[PDB]
Write a protein that binds this ligand. Structure first.
Ligand SMILES: Cc1cc(NC(=O)c2ccc(Br)cc2)n[nH]1
Ligand code: NA
Ligand code: NA
Ligand code: NA
Ligand code: NA
Ligand code: NA
Length: 287
């Protein structure tokens, strides 16, 4: 760590503090995250998982029984950008560019059998060139997703897939598509899709919009560990009411990203081929 000078505190992550820092060896400006042998091996494997839409993991330092992750630095996150774009909205071509890029990052990681499991606007980072990148890929498998962060802050449930909430033990890559669909809807409408404040509130918010799932739409759902037959039965809403003014192609794609049955939910690779991306471009964001 003597090789790094802290510039400022960027924020408080799930596992530890995040600093902007300078690498004295190379002059490099980096993001430095302060965080068992299985974790070291898992996280070390992530150094090779390189893609332009994945925040680059520069190094893993294990010392004095502390773990430091050194990442590529980006100047803004999507949560802050969404807040700053509240009054006007992020323009649709930029939303489309971001979604397209995020799907490319997911398709790459998924092809290597690596899941994120905790995607949220705060771990999507943006630059002034129009790129967006996924941060903290692979960390949930290494460390778990806790209920509270290291500062006691509540870890958000808003982007969590229903199979996780219903107690499935085995996650598929579909969990990340669900999260990204929730983010897409939030960029379009300027409000979170499913802002739950407990596990049951999260689940019932999903049910009230998409309908309470049953064996017709999701074979096996009624046998899931946390499923209860006493869940209320709500009707599904039309996406035309959920995400106006999104066009028919965008609503089609979103619907497929939010299918209940993870085996039905669209893959990142299939989503990239969707007609919504026919006119995709890479605008320069305002910032
Ligand atoms: C792993 C990583 C994080 C990061 N940057 C940020 O989180 C960041 C967010 C908002 C502002 Br304003 C400045 C920096 N870069 N790389
Ligand atoms: Na480094
Ligand atoms: Na390293
Ligand atoms: Na948000
Ligand atoms: Na839980
Ligand atoms: Na469109």
């Amino acid at each position: 760590m003597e090789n790094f000078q802290k510039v400022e505190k960027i924020g408080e992550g799930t596992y530890g503090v995040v600093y902007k820092a300078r690498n004295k060896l190379t002059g490099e400006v980096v993001a430095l995250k302060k965080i068992p042998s299985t974790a070291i091996r898992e996280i070390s494997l992530l150094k090779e998982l390189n893609h332009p839409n994945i925040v680059k993991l520069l190094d893993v330092i294990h010392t004095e029984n502390k773990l430091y992750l050194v990442f590529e630095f980006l100047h803004q996150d999507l949560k802050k950008f969404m807040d700053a774009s509240a009054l006007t909205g992020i323009p649709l071509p930029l939303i489309k560019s971001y979604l397209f890029q995020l799907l490319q990052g997911l398709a790459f990681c998924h092809s290597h059998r690596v899941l994120h499991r905790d995607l949220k606007p705060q771990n999507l980072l943006i630059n002034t060139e129009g790129a967006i990148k996924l941060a903290d890929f692979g960390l949930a498998r290494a460390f778990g997703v806790p209920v509270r962060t290291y500062t006691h802050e509540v870890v958000t449930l808003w982007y969590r897939a229903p199979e996780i909430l219903l107690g499935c033990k085995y996650y598929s890559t579909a969990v990340d598509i669900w999260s990204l669909g929730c983010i897409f809807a939030e960029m379009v409408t300027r409000r979170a899709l499913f802002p739950g404040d407990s596990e049951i509130d999260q689940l019932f918010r999903i049910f009230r919009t998409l309908g309470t799932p049953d064996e017709v739409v999701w074979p096996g759902v009624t046998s899931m560990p946390d499923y209860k037959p006493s869940f209320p039965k709500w009707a599904r809403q039309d996406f035309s009411k959920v995400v106006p003014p999104l066009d028919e192609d965008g609503r089609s794609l979103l619907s497929q990203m939010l299918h209940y049955d993870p085996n039905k939910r669209i893959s990142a690779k299939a989503a990239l081929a969707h007609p919504f991306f026919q006119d995709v471009t890479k605008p320069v964001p305002h910032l």
